[PDB]
Design a protein around this nucleic acid. Structure first.
Lengths: 147, 147
DNA sequence: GTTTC
DNA sequence: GTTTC
């Protein structure tokens, strides 16, 4: 029931698990499940090319990118396990330390991506999902998980 | 008197010192001064964008790229101090290990860039500069160095 | 490699 | 944040 808005193409790289950390200028005390909504801003083909070229370097030529980078859309969720300073980030994750130069690095784990994505309007920083949106999206994910 | 042809935009990134290593599928025993010629293949604006975006990640937002990426051109030279396997590369250069995934990584140091660049036709692998080309280009660099 | 395509 | 511009 807490969500972070992110520009595409970064947003969909997060729920895919290709992008493993998210840099910001502010610290969050939030820990645990964090939904990811794409902002309304439409990514350009140049920005897609630039990001895909960057992650082909970081993850290798085999990386499979999202087919599409939808905007203004609830995409899925990550688990926010830590919010490190850049210093702690270079120390604790030395093999991916080049992946974020930001003052604070959001450590993302266990991503899940919604097959059916809901249109949504975001807010600054980390913001509250409506209970109905939350139950709906989480119900959709259970249909993706073994029951 | 030994030269390596490299596609742009990687070629100019090498003599600028922005790109610090050069990956290949083959090992060279060569050590020391290695000239860099851009191949004839003209780089597309998308490739420039993709590479510049990648190196803004690796070197930060302050990196200043070559104004132009001339093709089929003797650009300058690096010092080839070692030719590491990917294994040794990750061990010896853990702070930049993500910058090349190639089987062999050419460790480049002390780059120099010709202000006046000479048109040139390349050859495979590491090839011999003609003595007159070599003396011309090295004479141009001395004009760039303190005497 | 460059040039042709 | 979205929307306007």
């Amino acid at each position: 029931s807490w969500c972070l808005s992110v520009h595409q193409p970064w947003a969909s790289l997060l729920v895919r698990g290709i992008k493993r950390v998210e840099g910001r200028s502010w610290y969050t005390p939030h820990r645990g499940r964090l939904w990811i909504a794409a902002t309304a801003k439409k990514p350009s083909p140049q920005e897609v090319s630039e990001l895909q070229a960057t992650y082909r370097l970081l993850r290798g030529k085999d990386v499979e990118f999202p087919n599409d980078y939808p905007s203004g859309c609830l995409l899925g969720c990550v688990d926010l396990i830590d919010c490190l300073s850049q210093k702690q980030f270079k120390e604790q994750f030395p093999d991916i330390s080049q992946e974020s130069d930001s003052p604070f690095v959001f450590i993302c784990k266990n991503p899940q991506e919604m097959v059916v994505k809901f249109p949504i309007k975001g807010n600054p920083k980390i913001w509250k999902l409506d209970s109905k949106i939350h139950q709906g999206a989480k119900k959709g994910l259970m249909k993706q998980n073994k029951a």
